[PDB]
């Protein structure tokens, strides 16, 4: 599958076949709205990206990356409720879309956490995730290359919308950056990556078209 | 070119330039997110939708719609809070999207209001709004015709996107019934009118190719 450019307002979006964690420069991953880390059947799941990138591809260790965390400099206004019951994993939520970077990696607080579903959204929560993902991606990495996968298109449930295509996500990862982009003179430099093992599932002509 | 039909995954959608009060069926009104009636220059502006619908279109009186609004079979889950303090207008605070219908009106909380700047929503809010409002029209009005205008193209101020252009959030609203109605076996039948007088802003050539999402 070859790497299409497409033009959104004047701003080069590429869309490409391949591994995130090969690209070069900096690499979004979802996380969930508490940041958690560990990986087990009950919290994070290996089959995930965040699950993959704590198991395989972090800087350093796991301690690192919590201390990492525990002490970021989160604006107060990126702090959400705090969940003191919680018996397994963190307990600080941070408001849909908050960054915390780490070296070359963006970590943004994707979906919600419920028990029995892990990882949970509704539609308008998705949207909300997006705008404000793009918004300060494009504010903090204007000019800068961000690549990321497909948000959405692994476990996470996005409620009334169970079985939403891999492609129908990826156009609204589009027009979103698009109504996001437009407000910027200078947007980041977006490519979104592929994975390899799911490129013939996603048709990309009414994408290149 | 006036008016065009695109097929959005199965399903006629129409976008043409008219009146909305004179469409025959269900018309949307955006109202504020208590259901604000008073029209001044303090509440409700005349010059928006819902000024005019409560100026010049009422079923009957304005008594007779705030009757109508306090006796509404509401939903529990439809509330927000109640502002207690508030000292001209209303008081319960309803959510975005939230439907009072009224005879042939479908009435919804599309914008926030403030003090200084009336009629607020940030982005994400406006989506939100899109999203809520098509699954409640799919849900309740499959296979009814319901009409709309541009939602957010009068006073509402998006913010960070004062000078956003009605042909862009034609698009969106385009995009979100998309979303929207892949999901029901039998969507509304849904016709968004364009005024006549800004028609010419808006290329319904463009406005075809987002039928694709
Ligand atoms: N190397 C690679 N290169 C490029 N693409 C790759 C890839 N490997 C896989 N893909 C694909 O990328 C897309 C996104 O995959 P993710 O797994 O990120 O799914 P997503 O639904 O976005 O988020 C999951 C949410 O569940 C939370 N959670 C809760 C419990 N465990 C996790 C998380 O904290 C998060 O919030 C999918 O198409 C994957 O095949
Ligand atoms: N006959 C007609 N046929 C068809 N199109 C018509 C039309 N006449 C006007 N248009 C156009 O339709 C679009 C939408 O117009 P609206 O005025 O509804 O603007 P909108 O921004 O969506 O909402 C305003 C929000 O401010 C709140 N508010 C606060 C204080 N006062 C009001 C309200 O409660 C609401 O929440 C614009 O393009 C209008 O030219």
Same mark, same amino acid.
């Given at each position: 599958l070859?790497?299409?450019?497409?033009?959104?307002?004047?701003?080069? +979006?590429?869309? !490409?076949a391949?591994?995130?964690?090969?690209?070069?420069?900096?690499k979004?991953?979802?996380?969930?709205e508490?940041?958690?880390?560990?990986?087990?059947?009950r919290?994070?799941?290996?089959?995930?990206?965040?699950?993959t990138?704590?198991?395989?591809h972090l800087?350093?260790?796991?301690?690192?990356?919590?201390?990492?965390?525990?002490?970021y400099?989160?604006?107060?206004?990126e702090?959400?409720?705090?969940?003191?019951?919680?018996?397994?994993?963190?307990?600080?939520?941070?408001?849909?879309?908050?960054?915390?970077?780490?070296?070359?990696?963006?970590?943004?607080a994707?979906? !919600?956490?419920?028990?029995?579903?892990?990882? +949970?959204?509704?539609?308008?929560?998705?949207? $909300?995730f997006?705008i404000?993902?793009?918004d300060?991606?494009?504010k +903090?990495?204007?000019?800068?290359?961000?690549?990321?996968?497909?948000f959405?298109?692994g476990?996470?449930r996005? !409620? $009334?919308?169970?079985?939403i295509?891999?492609?129908?996500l990826?156009k609204?990862?589009?027009?979103?950056?698009?109504?996001?982009?437009?407000?910027?003179?200078?947007p980041?430099?977006?490519?979104?990556?592929?994975?390899?093992? !799911?490129?013939?599932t996603?048709?990309?002509?009414?994408?290149?078209?």
């Amino acid at each position: 599958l070859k790497s299409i450019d497409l033009n959104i307002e004047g701003s080069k +979006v590429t869309v !490409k076949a391949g591994d995130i964690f090969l690209e070069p420069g900096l690499k979004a991953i979802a996380f969930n709205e508490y940041f958690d880390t560990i990986v087990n059947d009950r919290i994070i799941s290996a089959h995930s990206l965040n699950g993959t990138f704590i198991n395989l591809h972090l800087p350093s260790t796991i301690t690192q990356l919590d201390n990492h965390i525990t002490n970021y400099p989160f604006d107060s206004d990126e702090l959400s409720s705090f969940n003191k019951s919680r018996q397994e994993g963190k307990r600080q939520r941070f408001k849909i879309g908050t960054l915390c970077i780490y070296d070359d990696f963006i970590l943004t607080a994707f979906s !919600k956490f419920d028990a029995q579903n892990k990882a +949970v959204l509704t539609m308008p929560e998705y949207l $909300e995730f997006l705008i404000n993902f793009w918004d300060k991606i494009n504010k +903090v990495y204007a000019q800068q290359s961000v690549s990321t996968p497909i948000f959405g298109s692994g476990i996470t449930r996005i !409620k $009334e919308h169970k079985n939403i295509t891999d492609e129908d996500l990826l156009k609204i990862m589009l027009w979103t950056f698009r109504i996001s982009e437009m407000r910027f003179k200078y947007p980041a430099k977006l490519t979104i990556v592929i994975h390899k093992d !799911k490129i013939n599932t996603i048709n990309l002509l009414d994408i290149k078209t």
